[PDB]
Symmetry: C4
Subunit: 256 residues, 4 copies
């Protein structure tokens, strides 16, 4: 269909909302939750069918050729472009993956793969690129907004992994972990696997946002080797991200 | 009355001092104090009548039209301008609000409303923009001064809220709070509701200025969920504020 | 004498070295030491007579007028300049001030005044100006070097005051202090007034350089109200200093 | 031999890998290891003969004269260039130094000399300069990459020294040290000289990466005087390195 189709824009925004949800919830699902409770099952079904329908619509939509100004309309050409660009990855990240893990003898390697659903963030960067090409905004403000969104997103998906790393150890050796050795005030996170989900998520995101901003109170810190190797990796990338953010903001201020 | 009235400058500078006081004391009043002691009774009344006199004077004063260079004088449209722009908010933030709370069965929701007095910082930013207009100072130095004042002000108004959040919990569950769990040296902040006001304010502002500068010693930290959700919100905004400040300073140096 | 007197350069560098010593040792003398031991007495005498000889030499030197290019040689005007500019402040900070304190009943207010010797840092500032006007170097590199020297100097003079603030409290109430409540490893700084001078200086400068760089480990922190009010003042100025340093470095890189 | 020799490029890239290994392993060898185990015997010999072969090949390679565009070819002047340039240091840092220490009655001063092998990073900066002159990449991206590599390298070589400083103290006075006084979770680093090599390296690099990024959790900190004097030196240089990195990134962003 014509890219300028007015309902196609509404479909794009709907898919954007679903992609935002599926990129903010996938790291939580791999992390805090293990084998999702039966309540959120319908959410999984709805998301997967919605993204499959998006795949079909992409298969049935016309595109603008990049070599020259030529809005092509031949179905085979768009089919080759889609199949060669990213069609395989999205389809692989479209099968219900929780179901496979829950069926095939609860194997952790299967659950180690819903990370591939992170490819849905391509929709978000697509929207950022579209907003850039709009002349209403400036070249740099789009870059700063994109950089800030990426920093905030990597912070949440780093908090999720940082909590996950606490579940790798057996639940007898829980004292030798970032959570389970925590003692804030008069509250001890002894059996952290049994606390409310939101308490654990807030505790794990506290650590991530007092490091992405380089405050580091030190009330929550890595205790194992896995967690140390993860913290050094996280900070060595957040530093470059923050440097880029500061550089872009300064460039916006200088260009006037 | 003409804007160039020489006593009008004196009135503006006097209202500026009152606005500074009412913007640096409102978060303290919502925070550390609860139902202001009888000693400070007269100060509230004096401030409210002073700001009401400012309101009526703003009603009876000429303005400069923004569409074109016209120093207009006709009262009806100056009245309409005042009414639509900000007349409602200042008047709502002009009623004695401590009195209403102390009368109507000490309801916390009433006390949750003096935050509306923060609109008086409009006078401060008005002065900053006026100094921006003056050719005595540069375009960027005004921006750096404004950004530094906003950072320092939000730090104090964040310290006040951070202390307040420790008073939401009942005073039996006092050991699970940012304060009351503190132990500095050989001094334990056990009954923090009973310590001298200035000790509590200094302790709470210490935390705010060792996070606004991103030092984070870690001797004072969030312990509850409210306090964590507040610290993550505070740092995620102070980071952007500091990035903007650094960018503006760098731009001033570059264009220098 | 002629400003281009070749031995006058040697005298200027000699005075510069003495100014370095007297600006890096005055805060230590006000701080860690109280009523200097008899050993360093000759050092005090030599320093004061050296600066008095500098006073008389500057009284007996010619200058170049600032209103226009006029190397004036008339004694009355060259005397009037130094009389009105800084003769008083350089001379009050030239009397032996330790002797007065040790004589007049060991009064602390007298010892609270050798801070006036810090005006000798204007010699270092003038040296930086001399390096600036020289075309051998760039305009910005001089600024970055000056900024880095000021940052490092204020760090040492902040460490000295931070240790001094620990001596204001009586030596019974010593546990309620940043030092005396310290416990690093298995070493407890119990009687901190009796430890070796260099241990105390290194401990106090550790804190200053892990805050001037905004690291803040948190092993050393303010415990009283004096120390908190001092730390908030120190960080709120080191932040601006670091922002200025980063801006100047970025400007040098950009203009390069 | 003509510098444009195609096998000479392969030899240069091979010596580059060896230089990477010898610059990332020398600080570890001076640090964590003391008198390398017999297993790693062959690696040292292979490296030293490889660098000796590089030295003789440099003695038998043609070079480009810097005064004018002249690809000289006469062996005497290439020999003079080598001898006057950095050749003695390469030879001194080519003798097996572990062997000398293990033979000459295990004297620590001999082991204090393999630091001279750090001159091999000259090959890495040679490659960075070659990449700079290649027009494929920009002038600033080369500088940012070089700055980031230097920061990351100095962080590892600072972690190695920070662990080494823990071995200077006798193993009875082990509690008064940054490691050996550590207590992370329920694991106490009591006999730190007996833990696995990789645990100690990760623990010491954790500290270095959470200070090079200025996070400073405070779970690992200096306890002695040696370690404090080292931390103040490390931070006062990492700050300038980070400022330079931010400035270069900002200059790249502004340059468009
Ligand atoms: K920090
Ligand atoms: K800390």
């Amino acid at each position: 269909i014509h890219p300028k189709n007015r309902w196609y824009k509404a479909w794009e925004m709907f898919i954007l909302v679903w992609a935002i949800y599926s990129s903010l919830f996938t790291p939580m699902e791999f992390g805090f939750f293990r084998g999702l409770p039966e309540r959120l099952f319908v959410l999984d079904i709805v998301g997967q069918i919605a993204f499959l329908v998006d795949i079909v619509l992409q298969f049935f939509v016309a595109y603008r050729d990049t070599q020259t100004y030529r809005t092509v309309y031949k179905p085979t050409r768009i089919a080759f472009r889609y199949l060669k660009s990213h069609f395989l990855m999205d389809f692989i990240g479209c099968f219900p993956w929780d179901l496979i893990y829950k069926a095939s003898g609860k194997h952790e390697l299967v659950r180690y793969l819903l990370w591939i659903r992170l490819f849905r963030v391509r929709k978000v960067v697509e929207f950022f690129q579209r907003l850039e090409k709009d002349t209403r905004i400036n070249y740099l403000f789009t870059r700063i907004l994109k950089l800030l969104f990426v920093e905030v997103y990597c912070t949440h998906t780093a908090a999720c992994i940082f909590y996950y790393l606490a579940t790798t150890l057996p639940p007898e050796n829980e004292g030798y972990t970032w959570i389970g050795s925590l003692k804030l005030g008069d509250y001890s996170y002894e059996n952290f696997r049994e606390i409310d989900l939101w308490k654990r998520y807030t505790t794990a995101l506290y650590f991530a946002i007092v490091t992405m901003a380089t405050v580091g109170y030190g009330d929550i810190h890595a205790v194992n080797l896995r967690e140390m190797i993860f913290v050094m990796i996280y900070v060595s990338f957040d530093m470059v991200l923050g440097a880029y953010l500061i550089g872009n903001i300064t460039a916006l201020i200088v260009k006037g």
